[PDB]
Amino acid sequence: VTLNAQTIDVNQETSDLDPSKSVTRVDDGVASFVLNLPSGVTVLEFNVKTDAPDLPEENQAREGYRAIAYSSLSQSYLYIDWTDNHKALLVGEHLNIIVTPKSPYIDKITHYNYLILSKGKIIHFGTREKFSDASYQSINIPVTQNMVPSSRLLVYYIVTGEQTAELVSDSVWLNIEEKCGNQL
Amino acid sequence: CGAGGGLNNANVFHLAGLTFLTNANADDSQENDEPCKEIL
Amino acid sequence: APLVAFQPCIPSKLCKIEEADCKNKFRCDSGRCIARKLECNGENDCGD
Amino acid sequence: SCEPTRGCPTEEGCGERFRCFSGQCISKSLVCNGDSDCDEDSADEDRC
Amino acid sequence: DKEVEDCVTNRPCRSQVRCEGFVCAQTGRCVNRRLLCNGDNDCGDQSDEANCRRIYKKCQHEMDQYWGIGSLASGINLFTNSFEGPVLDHRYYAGGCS
Amino acid sequence: LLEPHCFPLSLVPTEFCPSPPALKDGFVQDEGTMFPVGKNVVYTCNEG
Amino acid sequence: QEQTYVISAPKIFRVGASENIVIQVYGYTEAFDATISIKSYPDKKFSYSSGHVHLSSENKFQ
Ligand SMILES: [Ca+2]
Numbered sequence: 001v002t003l004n005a006q007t008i009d010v011n012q013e014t015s016d017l018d019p020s021k022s023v024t025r026v027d028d029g030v031a032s033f034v035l036n037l038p039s040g041v042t043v044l045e046f047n048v049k050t051d052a053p054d055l056p057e058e059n060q061a062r063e064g065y066r067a068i069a070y071s072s073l074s075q076s077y078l079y080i081d082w083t084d085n086h087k088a089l090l091v092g093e094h095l096n097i098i099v100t101p102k103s104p105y106i107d108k109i110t111h112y113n114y115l116i117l118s119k120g121k122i123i124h125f126g127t128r129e130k131f132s133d134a135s136y137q138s139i140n141i142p143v144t145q146n147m148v149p150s151s152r153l154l155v156y157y158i159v160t161g162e163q164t165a166e167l168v169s170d171s172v173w174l175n176i177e178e179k180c181g182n183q184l
Numbered sequence: 185c186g187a188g189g190g191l192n193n194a195n196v197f198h199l200a201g202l203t204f205l206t207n208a209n210a211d212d213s214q215e216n217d218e219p220c221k222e223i224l
Numbered sequence: 225a226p227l228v229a230f231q232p233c234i235p236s237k238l239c240k241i242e243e244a245d246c247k248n249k250f251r252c253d254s255g256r257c258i259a260r261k262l263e264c265n266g267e268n269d270c271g272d
Numbered sequence: 273s274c275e276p277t278r279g280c281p282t283e284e285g286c287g288e289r290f291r292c293f294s295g296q297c298i299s300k301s302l303v304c305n306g307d308s309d310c311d312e313d314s315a316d317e318d319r320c
Numbered sequence: 321d322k323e324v325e326d327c328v329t330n331r332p333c334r335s336q337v338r339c340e341g342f343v344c345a346q347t348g349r350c351v352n353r354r355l356l357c358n359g360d361n362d363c364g365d366q367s368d369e370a371n372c373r374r375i376y377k378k379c380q381h382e383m384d385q386y387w388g389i390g391s392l393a394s395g396i397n398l399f400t401n402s403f404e405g406p407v408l409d410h411r412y413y414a415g416g417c418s
Numbered sequence: 419l420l421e422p423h424c425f426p427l428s429l430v431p432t433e434f435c436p437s438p439p440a441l442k443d444g445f446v447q448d449e450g451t452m453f454p455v456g457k458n459v460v461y462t463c464n465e466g
Numbered sequence: 467q468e469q470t471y472v473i474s475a476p477k478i479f480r481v482g483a484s485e486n487i488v489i490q491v492y493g494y495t496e497a498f499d500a501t502i503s504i505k506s507y508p509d510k511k512f513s514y515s516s517g518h519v520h521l522s523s524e525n526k527f528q
Contacts, residue, residue, distance in 0.1 A: 011373045071192045075353065084187075104353060107338045111526060113490055117201055120476055122486045127526045150224075152188075154200045158208045158470045158492050162340045162352055163293060165467045167193040167208045171200045173224060203477045208470040211287025232420055235508040253301055277426045279498065282469050293352070293414070295467070306380075308418035318354045318415055319376040419511075429499050429518065456513060 001031040002051040010040035021051055028086065042069050074166040076103035076159055078112065088175040089143045095174070097139040097153070099128065103168065105159045112136060112157040116174075118147045143174075145181035150174070185220035290316065342368060360413055379417040385410075431455070469493040479504065489519060490528045497522040 001024060005017040017035055024031040037044065049062035070077055081098040089095065101109050109130065116124040123146040128137040139153065154171040190196030194212040197204050203212050246257035252270030262269045286297035292310035302309040304320040339350035344363030355362040357372035369375070393410035394403040431454035438446050438453070444463035453459065471491045479485050487502050499520045506512040521527050 068191060070190065070196075080188075105340055108340070113528065115202070115474065115488060117476075120201065120478075120480065121483075122202075122474070122476070122488060125488045125528065127528055129526075152200055154196065154202065156193075156196075156472065158206075158472065160340065160468060160493070162350070163295075163467070164291075165208045165470055167204075167206055167210045167472065169190070169193050169196040171188045171190070171196050173187045197474065198477070201477055202474050204475070205473040206471060207282050207284040207467070208472065209285035209287075209291050209467075214288040234420060234510045237508065279423060280469065281424065282471065283467055285467070293354075308416070310415075312414065312416070312418075314378065314415040314417060315354065317378050317417065318358070429501060431518075458515065 002049055003033055004047045004049075005035055006045050007038055007041050008043045008045075009038055010042055013040075030086065032086075034083075043067065070170075072166060072168065074104070074159070074161055074164055074168075076101075076105055076166055076168050078102070078155060078157060078168045078170045080153075080155060080170045080172045082172050084172075086175070088177045090177045091145065091148060091179045092142050094142055095139050097172070099136060099139065099155055099170075101136065101157055101159075101168070103159060105161060106134070108159050109157055112155060114139060114153060114155045116147065117152045117154070119149060123147065123151075143176055147174070147176045148179060148181075149176070151176055185217050186222040187224055292316070344368065354415065358415065362412060364409070378415060383417070473502065487517075488528070489521065491521055492527065494521075494527055495523075497524075 002019060002021045004019055007015045007017065009015065015038060020033055020035075022031045022033060035044070035046075044067045045064070046067065047062060047064045049057075050060050052060070055061075079100045079102055081100060099112060101112055103109060111127050111129050113127050114125070115122050124141065124144070126141070128139065130136050139155075143151075151174045152171060153174050154169065156167060156169040158165055158167055185201075186199050188199070190199050192210075194204075194210045194214060198212045198215045198217070204210075244251065244255070244257055248260050249257035250260055250263050250270075251257050253272040254270070256270060256272075258269050283295065285291050285295065288300070289297040290300050290303050291297055292315045293313040294311070296311065298309050298316060303316045305316065306320075308314040309316045341350050341352040342356055343350060344365065344367045346365040346367060347363055349363055351362040351368055356368050357375050359369070359375045359377040362368045390410045391403065393408050394405055395407040396402060397404050431452075433455045434452045435455065435457070438459050440446070441461060441463065444461055446459050447462045448459040469491070470493055471489065473487065473489050475487050476485060485504075489500060489502060497520070499518055501516050501518050503516040504514045506514070
């Protein structure tokens, strides 16, 4: 499998990553990549094609996709630092996700907050606070039994400008080990 | 529906299966989803 | 002493007003369905 | 001075509607309409 | 009408009321971030329009200031009945262009 | 009744049920110092 | 707008389903309380459930 990636800047500038290649895995089906991106990136349009040499390339199957920045009117953002790791977190282990409130207004952001859905319902909630080092506490809490089929973590803060204010948010799917509380 | 993130603040919550009430300038009443097919 | 009064109040039924499909007439952004002949008219027949 | 059992009311924005710098609310069909639809601060005309 | 001197005291001070938008480097004004690169001088000394990766204009035509509108911008000594000097920035347009 | 938060509130109740009746071989799944008018409780019968 | 809130809830409440409904507030330096409630519609005069949550510096307004 091989990939093409036309990033677009904050301004007119269109910039292409070098074309990349990998194989779909044998036990997982996944072909996985990681793209570096411009610090100004507004969007990416990317294409993927099957690079299998047996294909006459005009019948070689391909797909095109588009990916977008989180579109803060106030240009205030919230990023979950998670690499989308495929292996599930083991029951009762501490979660180890860092978070960054990237914002023009961070002196107003004392804290950020988070929620965990499992199946349909919120099963945990909490708050995370600013260090003197100007980073913020990580999402540490143990992967309790209420999460185990799978779970979703959502994160937010609200910040003021001078006179606007904006909800600022991110979310990540967390894969959790298929192990029960009855332990049967 | 889907693995995470969103187009905007309201759409993060909406894609995450939440909804919300806020005075901080958003409302996911703006939004709908299709019959979902985003396999994770 | 003003001749009418209105009090803010809780509903007790759904609103039953329809949207207009208007049989291929051209629905302007403020909701007027102008005549289909006027699509790409020139001038401005919607106001909108 | 007085310690109130009364809350200060919060103040509330626009949801599906666009919001100007003042806090007034305006339709999204009036963003980049090129008139000044926001009465004073024309945030509907910013960086289009 | 005055005399003033420097000091050596060490009492705490909370003078850092946050400029949330952008500090106007010369004037010490703050301006909201939608006004940077609006094609207009919101800082007084043109600071806000530095390093604009693009500029966006708003006013489609030339537009006069209303006459004397910068004169009204100044406060009065109510007792001499005189304008004394400048208090509100009647060259500030916040987007505007209506 | 429409817009309560504009007014003062005693948001802490001052009208209550007495504590719910017990049951043979079961208990009130909820517990507290008082139950305000129109607050629910649910029962669960004990093991077996 | 110095003072703000979010309530969050599932996109759909399930009937008989002990829904866990979260509030946060901001721009506050004083504690207060709130009766988050599920009520009759359209008529807003009956309550299917309520909870008098306390919002305080202890819980960082959550
Ligand atoms: Ca400017």
